[PDB]
C-alpha cells in the first residue's frame, strides 16, 4: 500500500450527499457525464450510492442516473456508464473526521476527488494531502 488504512465509521446502507467543506458544495454527476459541485440541496444529481468492492475500496454512483464517478488518465473526473477500474476509490478517514477518496488506479500519484471553492472539480495532479478541497462529509439524503 502507498497509503494509510484509517477508515471512516460510516456504512453504505443508504445513499448520501458528499459535502465538501472547501466551498460548501455537494459532489454532482450530471446526466451528460460532467462532474462538478453545487450548493443546491434540491439538485437531483447529488444523491450518491456508495458500495464497497474490497475493504476500503468504493464505487460512488449517481442514484439518479446510474453513472459511476471515475477519474481519467489525465486526472479529470467524469461520470461513467459502467463500473470500471478508473471508478474505484480508496475511501479513508482524514484529520480524524472527514472522508477522502483517492483514485485507486492513480493511488501512487495521490490523485484525490476534490472540489474547489468555486464549485469546479480539481484535476488529479492538482490535489494533495493537506488541502481542504479533498475533505468530504457524507450526509444523509
Alpha helices (runs of H) in 4-124, residue ranges in sequence order: none
CA torsion sign for 105, 106, 108, 113 is negative
Q: Return the C-alpha cell found at 140.
A: 444523509
Alpha helices (runs of H) in 54-97, residue ranges in sequence order: none
C-alpha distances in Å from residue 58, one per residue of 41, 49, 52, 83, 118: 23, 10, 4, 10, 26
- The C-alpha atoms of residue 27 and residue 17 are separated, in whole angstroms, by 7
SS3 126: helix
Cβ-contact 116, 102 below 8 angstroms: no
**Resolution in A, one decimal?**
1.9
Distance of CA 106 to the CA centre of its chain: 14
Q: Return the C-alpha cell found at 49.
A: 450510492
Q: Has 11 been labeled as part of a binding site? A: no
Cβ-contact 61, 55 below 8 angstroms: no
Q: Tell me how many degrees the CA angle 24-35-81 measures, rounded to the nearest 5.
A: 140
SS3 108: helix
Number of Cβ within a 10 Å radius of residue 108: 10
Cβ-contact 88, 104 below 8 angstroms: yes
- The C-alpha atoms of residue 19 and residue 38 are separated, in whole angstroms, by 10
- The C-alpha atoms of residue 92 and residue 103 are separated, in whole angstroms, by 11
Residues 6+ apart with CB under 8 A from 14: 140, 141
Q: What is the CATH number of domain 1-141?
A: 2.80.10.50
Categorise residue 110: left if φ over 0, alpha if ψ from -120 to 50, beta otherwise: left
Domain spans of the chain?
1-141
* Stretch (H or E) spanning 35: strand 35-38
Cβ-contact 34, 79 below 8 angstroms: yes
Amino acid at each position: 500500500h502507498h497509503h494509510h488504512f484509517n477508515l471512516p465509521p460510516g456504512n453504505y446502507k443508504k445513499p448520501k450527499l458528499l459535502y465538501c467543506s472547501n466551498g460548501g458544495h455537494f459532489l454532482r454527476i450530471l446526466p451528460d457525464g460532467t462532474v462538478d459541485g453545487t450548493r443546491d440541496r434540491s439538485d437531483q444529481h447529488i444523491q450518491l450510492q456508495l458500495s464497497a468492492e474490497s475493504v476500503g475500496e468504493v464505487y460512488i454512483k449517481s442514484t439518479e442516473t446510474g453513472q459511476y464517478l471515475a477519474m481519467d488518465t489525465d486526472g479529470l473526473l467524469y461520470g461513467s456508464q459502467t463500473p470500471n477500474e478508473e471508478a474505484l476509490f480508496l475511501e479513508r478517514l482524514e484529520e480524524n473526521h472527514y472522508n477522502t477518496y483517492i483514485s485507486k488506479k492513480h493511488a501512487e500519484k495521490n490523485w484525490f476527488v476534490g472540489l474547489k471553492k468555486n464549485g469546479s472539480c480539481k484535476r488529479g495532479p492538482r490535489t494533495h494531502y493537506g488541502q481542504k478541497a479533498i475533505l468530504f462529509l457524507p450526509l444523509p439524503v
